[PDB]
Design an enzyme around this catalytic site. Sequence first.
Site, PDB file in Angstrom:
ATOM      1  N   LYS B 159       0.744  -0.996  -0.002  1.00  0.00           N
ATOM      2  CA  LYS B 159       0.019   0.146   0.175  1.00  0.00           C
ATOM      3  C   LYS B 159       0.793   1.195   0.037  1.00  0.00           C
ATOM      4  O   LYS B 159       1.036   2.448  -0.895  1.00  0.00           O
ATOM      5  CB  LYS B 159      -1.034   0.373   1.016  1.00  0.00           C
ATOM      6  CG  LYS B 159      -1.785  -0.391   1.008  1.00  0.00           C
ATOM      7  CD  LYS B 159      -3.047  -0.777   2.075  1.00  0.00           C
ATOM      8  CE  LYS B 159      -2.554  -0.811   3.588  1.00  0.00           C
ATOM      9  NZ  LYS B 159      -1.159  -1.919   3.681  1.00  0.00           N
ATOM     10  N   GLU B 185       1.185   6.250  10.906  1.00  0.00           N
ATOM     11  CA  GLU B 185       1.581   5.617  10.174  1.00  0.00           C
ATOM     12  C   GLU B 185       3.934   5.151  10.759  1.00  0.00           C
ATOM     13  O   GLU B 185       3.816   5.865  11.710  1.00  0.00           O
ATOM     14  CB  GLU B 185       1.618   5.649   8.554  1.00  0.00           C
ATOM     15  CG  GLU B 185       0.997   4.423   8.554  1.00  0.00           C
ATOM     16  CD  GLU B 185       0.452   3.341   8.609  1.00  0.00           C
ATOM     17  OE1 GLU B 185       1.003   2.491   7.833  1.00  0.00           O
ATOM     18  OE2 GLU B 185      -0.512   3.329   9.132  1.00  0.00           O
ATOM     19  N   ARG B 186       4.373   5.174  10.393  1.00  0.00           N
ATOM     20  CA  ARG B 186       5.777   5.244  10.617  1.00  0.00           C
ATOM     21  C   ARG B 186       6.371   6.484  10.670  1.00  0.00           C
ATOM     22  O   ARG B 186       5.673   6.475   9.450  1.00  0.00           O
ATOM     23  CB  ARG B 186       6.504   4.002  10.300  1.00  0.00           C
ATOM     24  CG  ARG B 186       5.767   2.083   9.674  1.00  0.00           C
ATOM     25  CD  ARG B 186       6.816   0.928   9.459  1.00  0.00           C
ATOM     26  NE  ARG B 186       5.858  -0.080   9.176  1.00  0.00           N
ATOM     27  CZ  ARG B 186       4.772  -0.594   8.698  1.00  0.00           C
ATOM     28  NH1 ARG B 186       4.125   0.776   7.346  1.00  0.00           N
ATOM     29  NH2 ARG B 186       4.264  -1.733   8.715  1.00  0.00           N
TER      30      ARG B 186
HETATM   31  N1  ADP Z   1       6.598  -2.854  -6.388  1.00  0.00           N
HETATM   32  C1  ADP Z   1       6.868  -3.695  -5.774  1.00  0.00           C
HETATM   33  N2  ADP Z   1       8.735  -4.263  -5.843  1.00  0.00           N
HETATM   34  C2  ADP Z   1       8.632  -4.862  -5.181  1.00  0.00           C
HETATM   35  N3  ADP Z   1       8.472  -5.045  -3.732  1.00  0.00           N
HETATM   36  C3  ADP Z   1       7.630  -4.215  -3.539  1.00  0.00           C
HETATM   37  C4  ADP Z   1       6.434  -3.888  -4.629  1.00  0.00           C
HETATM   38  N4  ADP Z   1       5.837  -3.605  -3.236  1.00  0.00           N
HETATM   39  C5  ADP Z   1       6.028  -3.697  -1.528  1.00  0.00           C
HETATM   40  N5  ADP Z   1       6.939  -4.825  -2.445  1.00  0.00           N
HETATM   41  C6  ADP Z   1       7.851  -5.347  -0.520  1.00  0.00           C
HETATM   42  O1  ADP Z   1       7.032  -5.220   0.241  1.00  0.00           O
HETATM   43  C7  ADP Z   1       7.065  -4.432   0.812  1.00  0.00           C
HETATM   44  C8  ADP Z   1       5.629  -3.815   1.791  1.00  0.00           C
HETATM   45  O2  ADP Z   1       5.086  -2.277   1.337  1.00  0.00           O
HETATM   46  P1  ADP Z   1       4.513  -1.345   1.399  1.00  0.00           P
HETATM   47  O3  ADP Z   1       3.845  -1.165   0.896  1.00  0.00           O
HETATM   48  O4  ADP Z   1       5.594  -0.780   2.877  1.00  0.00           O
HETATM   49  O5  ADP Z   1       3.719  -2.280   3.154  1.00  0.00           O
HETATM   50  P2  ADP Z   1       2.195  -1.692   3.320  1.00  0.00           P
HETATM   51  O6  ADP Z   1       1.523  -2.716   2.167  1.00  0.00           O
HETATM   52  O7  ADP Z   1       2.014  -2.218   3.988  1.00  0.00           O
HETATM   53  O8  ADP Z   1       1.898  -0.140   2.855  1.00  0.00           O
HETATM   54  C9  ADP Z   1       7.859  -3.135   0.877  1.00  0.00           C
HETATM   55  O9  ADP Z   1       9.026  -3.062   2.496  1.00  0.00           O
HETATM   56  C10 ADP Z   1       8.200  -4.181   0.016  1.00  0.00           C
HETATM   57  O10 ADP Z   1       9.884  -4.969   0.336  1.00  0.00           O
HETATM   58 MG    MG Z   2       1.948   0.692   5.132  1.00  0.00          MG
END
Ligand code: ADP
Ligand code: MG
Lengths: 469, 468, 339, 394, 46
Positions: B159, B185-186
């Site tokens: 997300k 969030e963080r």
């Molecule tokens: N397009 C992408 N390509 C490669 N890895 C991804 C991608 N999107 C997310 N990730 C992996 O999944 C993790 C979670 O993404 P993030 O959006 O930060 O968490 P959340 O969905 O909880 O917000 C990321 O830190 C990354 O390592």
């Molecule tokens: Mg997040």
Amino acid sequence: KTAGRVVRITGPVVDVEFPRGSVPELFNALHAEITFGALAKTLTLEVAQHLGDSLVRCISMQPTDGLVRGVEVTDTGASISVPVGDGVKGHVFNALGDCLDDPGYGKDFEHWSIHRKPPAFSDLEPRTEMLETGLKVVDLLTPYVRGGKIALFGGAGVGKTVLIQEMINRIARNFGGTSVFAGVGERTREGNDLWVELADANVLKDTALVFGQMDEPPGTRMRVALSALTMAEFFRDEQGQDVLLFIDNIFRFTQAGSEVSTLLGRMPSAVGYQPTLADEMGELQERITSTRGRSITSMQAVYVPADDYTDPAPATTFAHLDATTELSRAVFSKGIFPAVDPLASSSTILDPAIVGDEHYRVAQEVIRILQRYKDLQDIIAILGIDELSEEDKQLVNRARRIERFLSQNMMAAEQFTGQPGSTVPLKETIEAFDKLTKGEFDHLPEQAFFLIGGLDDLAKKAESLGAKL
Amino acid sequence: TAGRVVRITGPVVDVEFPRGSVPELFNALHAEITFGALAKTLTLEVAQHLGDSLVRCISMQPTDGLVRGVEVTDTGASISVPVGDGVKGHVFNALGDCLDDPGYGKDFEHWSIHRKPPAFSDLEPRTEMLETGLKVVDLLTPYVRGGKIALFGGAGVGKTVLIQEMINRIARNFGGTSVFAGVGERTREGNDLWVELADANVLKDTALVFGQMDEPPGTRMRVALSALTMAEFFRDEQGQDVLLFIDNIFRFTQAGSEVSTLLGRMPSAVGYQPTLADEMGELQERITSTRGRSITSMQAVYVPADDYTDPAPATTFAHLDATTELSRAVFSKGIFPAVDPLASSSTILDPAIVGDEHYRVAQEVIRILQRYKDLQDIIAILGIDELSEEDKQLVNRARRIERFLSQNMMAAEQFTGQPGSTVPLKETIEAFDKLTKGEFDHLPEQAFFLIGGLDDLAKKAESLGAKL
Amino acid sequence: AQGAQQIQLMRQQLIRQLRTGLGAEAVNKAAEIVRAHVADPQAQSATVDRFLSELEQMAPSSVTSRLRAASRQSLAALVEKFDSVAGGLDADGLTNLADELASVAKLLLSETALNKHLAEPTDDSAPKVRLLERLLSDKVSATTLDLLRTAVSNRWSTESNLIDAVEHTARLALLKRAEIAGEVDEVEEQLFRFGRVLDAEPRLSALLSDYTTPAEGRVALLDKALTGRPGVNQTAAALLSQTVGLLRGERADEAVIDLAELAVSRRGEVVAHVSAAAELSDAQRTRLTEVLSRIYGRPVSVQLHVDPELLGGLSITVGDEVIDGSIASRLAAAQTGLP
Amino acid sequence: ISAADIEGAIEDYVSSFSADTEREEIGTVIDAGDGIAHVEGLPSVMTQELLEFPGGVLGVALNLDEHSVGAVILGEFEKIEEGQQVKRTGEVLSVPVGDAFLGRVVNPLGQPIDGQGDIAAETRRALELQAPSVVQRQSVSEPLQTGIKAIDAMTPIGRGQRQLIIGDRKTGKTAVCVDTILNQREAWLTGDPKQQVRCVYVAIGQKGTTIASVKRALEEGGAMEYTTIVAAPASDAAGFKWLAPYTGSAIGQHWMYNGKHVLIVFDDLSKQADAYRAISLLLRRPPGREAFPGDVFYLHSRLLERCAKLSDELGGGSMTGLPIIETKANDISAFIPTNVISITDGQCFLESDLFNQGVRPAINVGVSVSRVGGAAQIKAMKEVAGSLRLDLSQ
Amino acid sequence: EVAQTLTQADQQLSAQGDQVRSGLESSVDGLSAKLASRILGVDVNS
Ligand SMILES: Nc1ncnc2c1ncn2[C@@H]1O[C@H](COP(=O)(O)OP(=O)(O)O)[C@@H](O)[C@H]1O
Ligand SMILES: [Mg+2]
Ligand SMILES: Nc1ncnc2c1ncn2[C@@H]1O[C@H](COP(=O)(O)OP(=O)(O)OP(=O)(O)O)[C@@H](O)[C@H]1O
Ligand SMILES: Nc1ncnc2c1ncn2[C@@H]1O[C@H](COP(=O)(O)OP(=O)(O)OP(=O)(O)O)[C@@H](O)[C@H]1O
Ligand SMILES: [Mg+2]
Ligand SMILES: [Mg+2]
């Protein structure tokens, strides 16, 4: 004078009002009197809470039926204490220290309070000396620790008590130290059977038995473990004698704690358990422990309610153990005794550092084969074995033979099947399971591996079936 | 006329005022913590009138060190935050304090964060596609300019990465104003976003409002309102197009539920406050474009424990025009962005708005993926050889389609080292038409993984020995 | 290197054990010499004087409480009204006023509905005043009626606050007649002694501290046991008897302590309980009173609770603040203060 | 062994002895039990203030109402009785901090429990000082090598990052964390504080002999020189179990704010959550899902947000967090696991199934992620492990 | 060799500690007297 009076009675829990300045300390024992004819007795109440207004909430050790409001309550000035010394060995006691097999015995003994702090952290030392039992599955996959803590988990009727009897036979029989058995909320006739069996085997002279069984108020069922543990602690800390401590069943201690918490008015935790579940369990368990130079090998049967291994009670119990045998309903259904789940059981000393490289390698190969078989169960339940690859078919045959060979004719199983038990040396177990994992017995029929000891038994049974080893 | 603290229990404080001086609901009161280590001025928000001249209030700051009976002062108004063009380029907290420049904006006009939503007569549905360059979003979940967009997903499914990607794709070329609201969030993510916006030179157009997960429940409850107040000023007063990014809007509900029982509210199902839907509607109905005034809002919505039937996401669903639903299954397969094509939706994905070709191609893709989902367990148990020839062809096509829906994202470079790509909508429609027709069945499925358009597909197929 | 570190740790541990043993023996010998040196009464007096000097070296403190702000203000208005009214009243008139007020308080307590109706705050008190006049215009005297109309006209947070206020006014009248007579110190001392004896006999208080039995019976029990004695002051006797009669779920000892606090507070002073190992000298008592008054601004009366375990010094508790100069506290600190 | 030193020390203490009197605000215990007490009085007590009970027992004021103060006893509550006198300390809950805590085992109050004498505290730190703001940090850029390929290549951990180690019992979580602590031995031997990592191992609700085993393992590998253990064994009161992670965090924060790099392991936060739930229920606060209090997520969010990477203006110190979470029957959907997964900067998710297959460490590649990514790796590792995790998922 | 050195050092330090303790037995009286002087607030000759 300074005696309190009963103000409220809610089953085992009693509220007592004392004059100001005479409120008893927490965990003090108090005495009340029931005077009704058939139920006349003296109640021992353990102070549990200070409610304010010079009121104390207490947990009764005997049933409170017949108790009246306003009866005088006397403070003993101390906590519940039990007799200690070499005299306890060979005799049966209840949670309060009363001798059952000979009333009045042990009244002149030194008495220790059943409440004490655990050993200081600086006195704790990890234990890693393997305890060889002679059971193939235990010795191979969940090696027990001498001076450590072992547990046997299992739902209703999977073989916890029979395995406790097996371990009493295999460990306590030729044991130089003392043994303490704590029946905690289990069948009374099981206590009688254990008493008679220990007398017959001549182990009773070295054993102290403390029973608070099913038909006891929750207070007794939650303090009997403390009483037996106090006798064990005396043997550990005062005579410097290796102690065996068998407990059956510790989940019943947790259950009695939950009942008391409900009666005490505490707000329930998840699944209706007491909020202090982990704290009570830790307070009890940290006392059961070897110290530097002083060994207690403790073995506790843990009941799993409704076969639910995620229930809070066993879930919190898991952390307090060095070795954990998990008895499974499915393994029991297959007829495999002991009905140990080799994938869910564990031992802290099952690493190449302690048990050696070959022991570890053989155990890991057995675990890998059984894990692959568990993975393939989903396919096999529908299509059978014939849709698998040749590698998977060979592995499945090997795994079925391995799981049958982990079963064993136990010493304590003779009363059930009439077949005498077998003891397998650890070296032979490692050799045999190394041979199995390498497919050296694949030609033998599966039933050749069922309820036997070592490789000689395997040869004899295979020959009787029709295959030659 | 000042009140005094009577009860302190976590973030909830009871305050007694003299009769006739009881503050109105949602008024901001001030109390002092004089202890040296934690000396501060607590802002409390009146939550309830308990009667007998008592008010229950939610602290905006930690109550550690607060003493009973201390003087409580009523400001006479609700929490208010600075508004105007001066907020752009700066970082604020829920209370309107500038973080990167303390004292900045104290002389600006201050708007109360509590406000009614636009009148129904001023609401005009928005049907205008907002192209992003992401294949999956543009094809299956086309976003709406001036509409409400959400990214649903469990913890750690992409997300935040997707929000950053959309900030890059949409806000960078945006002619109007951007408002980012970090809600529970963080803090590290907030710092990263601040630095990244500064690097891209997008910050000067952006107002950042942060209340992070280390803040008490009250701050997490009111930070979204603060950011939305700034955005509302830019919409109504300045008369400019606004981008509003919120991450994570579920934290507003979660913070509401954290203090719900301490406020004396009986819990609802699944441990949520009884007023879940009401508070959510009060906040969301303000996040809208009105007639001639545009707010393109993009919200990240956390789905607790991947459970899309959880009351919070389920209630949130109704407030959105477009929803991109990220899946843990797609994520664990390695597809990125981990969109669930069968679950995501958009109200403008109909032939009238996107056109017959786009709609037909999207529907065919959805049909193929649905059939593949139905056949997945059959393939797992009985193997693929026991399918019909048509089913086998459909499975090959569906695997290629699902891989091609993945894309090397601009914001994902730090996670893959591969620079991102942008695929024009026309190319996306054409490529997926070809895929559904089976014109790329001769290429290995690995050729379709994390690429851009058709040229990238041809190059990767060449690298793998195939020819396109 | 591991072996060398273990050796160094062993050395440090040995040093630690030696230091702990030396310190333990030294502090135990210090305790012995302290307990021996405090035996001499002159030593006790010297320690008390030193603690007093410490008090004169101390800076002054920065500084009915259970009543809420509204009820507290209402009771303040009621007490000032009583103070204005009582100027013309005499001893017999004050006794009649106190008896009438106690009777009215028990009437309200027994008749819950009337007190409930009479306690609801209202902007206009005219209906309440009319209700009082229709109820007991002739039963009680004019002063009692005026005090009751004042009490109802004000605002009470809870119904029981009205009964509390009426009882407070009755006690106020009894203390006012005591002051007019001139036995204020005598009544204070007698109330404190009654509190002490009730504290010594908790069971007597518990028996007296129940309203489940008729008030006259418990009043008679109090008269026979404690109050009905040759030296008991008449005003203190009547005050305590009415207080026990009007008890509503409170311990007699606590009520007596509250009565003594109120009696001393009427003069504007504050009660401070001072625990000492040995009885103070009159010069010591005067110095302590002066220094405590200076510390707390307003004058304070001093109550002594001799306890040998203090081993000199004083432990002064007042207004929920304790100054613990007892030598026993110093010994405990030294015991626990070792490295 | 110099006796003269022993005398000198004892004389120095005795001379320093000044038990001077002062004014104290008191209260009285009105009811106590199960590690909770209620205190009348204390008109000036402040929320979460340390209270002194008779016999050296300490409590913390959690509930403040017009009547009493609901306080949590921090150890040895069996001596608390109605009518006892409770003192103010005039200071919120705080612990000693200093370089002397390295190599020691302390309880959540910082008192040594290894029986090796007192600890010379540089100063005291309050346990609820807020985490660095958005503007006080800088992006995570320095790797924290664990020595484990599966982690360093696929879910790299940087300095200032919170990486969650989550999995069923006996899946290797403690092994991963202890290996990570031991791997910092070379960095410590360099002697350069820009490279040194100081480790804090917080043991919550763990068996005493298990903590002894961890300490022995750290000793054998030389890690105990640069490691502090904050131990709250199972025998401890719920107060210590709830408080231990904050004590360890405060100790680590003292070093972090002075330019040092800290690594803190919470083993494990599931037991802290259970202890906090027990305390909240005993205080009769309204429960939530699974009886946990409403603010159970806040409990861990404010704890793990203190693990940060400070900006150069604050010294450039960092504190890396390795919280551990135990799942039951591989249910990462349980309340506490889902709470924590949404807090940390990625997770290493360990499986019994993978462990039994010989895949050790049992990292579930598909589900495990690092939210720092290549920024937490050196250039060579990035170049070789650019898309390893994605490839393994595929 | 580490174990041998450890046991040798243990014996040597035990002997040294015992003899220093015996030597310092004397000063305990002065220590206690001076600490008591500190506690009482006035010098105590005893
Ligand atoms: N397009 C992408 N390509 C490669 N890895 C991804 C991608 N999107 C997310 N990730 C992996 O999944 C993790 C979670 O993404 P993030 O959006 O930060 O968490 P959340 O969905 O909880 O917000 C990321 O830190 C990354 O390592
Ligand atoms: Mg997040
Ligand atoms: N080794 C064995 N060989 C044969 N039968 C066995 C064996 N172990 C157990 N059983 C059968 O299972 C029954 C239950 O055994 P046991 O009483 O030990 O179980 P448990 O787990 O302690 O049960 P519960 O929950 O009732 O206490 C035994 O009575 C016997 O019928
Ligand atoms: N990489 C590894 N290779 C082999 N064995 C390992 C590995 N990591 C851990 N183990 C072993 O697995 C068992 C479990 O390890 P560990 O104690 O770290 O797990 P845990 O999840 O912390 O357990 P617990 O539930 O007891 O806290 C131990 O025997 C440990 O030696
Ligand atoms: Mg059984
Ligand atoms: Mg572990």
